Amino acid sequence: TPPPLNFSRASEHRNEKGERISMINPRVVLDENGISHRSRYFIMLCDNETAIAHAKKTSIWAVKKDSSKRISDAYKKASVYFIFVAQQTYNALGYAQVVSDLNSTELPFWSDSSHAGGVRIKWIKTCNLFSAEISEIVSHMDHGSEARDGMEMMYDEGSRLCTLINYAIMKRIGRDR
RNA sequence: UUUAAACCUA
């Protein structure tokens, strides 16, 4: 059990060269946004149970136009993960790796004109999990304010969310299957 | 009926 994660001085975590490093694994070098060039994480906030259930069944997600370019750019450069969060309750729904690039023609039936295109995903965990620290992370993910759908999060936010999801599921808390 | 990845592994 490592001590609580805090971003008040997260920018102060530096290696000997002066590069920003992760607070969770100091070997991971970050840019000045706290993002790892190798592993990148975006939040998908969603209240549509039809969409979420379709996504967990068919391993497809519709990407918003307002975040599609940054996600498409990240996919060509890094491993890219979506962490799915219920928009009103902040329950974690799971997380998945993006495994194909944006595609304007391959959109799920539930997508609308706010979406740019479809991506295939590979679910890593699925859940329906309430965790107070997950909810706190999502609540502060936009410079201390609530997450915006599709935004990229810092490496330590993504990694801690994956850890928290894995831990609960292993404790048989918050499973969906 | 759910080994996160990566990094590091004497």
Numbering used by the authors: 312 to 488
Sentences from the paper on this structure:
Mmi1 is an essential RNA-binding protein in the fission yeast Schizosaccharomyces pombe that eliminates meiotic transcripts during normal vegetative growth. Surprisingly, Mmi1 binds DSR RNA using a divergent mechanism on a surface that is distinct from the m6A-binding pocket, including extended protein sequences located upstream and downstream of the YTH domain. We propose that the low-complexity region influences RNA binding indirectly by reducing dynamic motions of the RNA-binding groove and stabilizing a conformation of the YTH domain that binds to RNA with high affinity.
To determine whether nucleotides outside the UNAAAC motif are recognized by Mmi1, we determined a crystal structure of USR–YTH (residues 301–488) bound to an 11-mer RNA containing a DSR. In this structure, the longer RNA does not form any additional contacts with the YTH domain, and RNA binding is confined to the DSR motif. Furthermore, the conformation of the N-terminal USR is largely similar to those seen in the other structures.
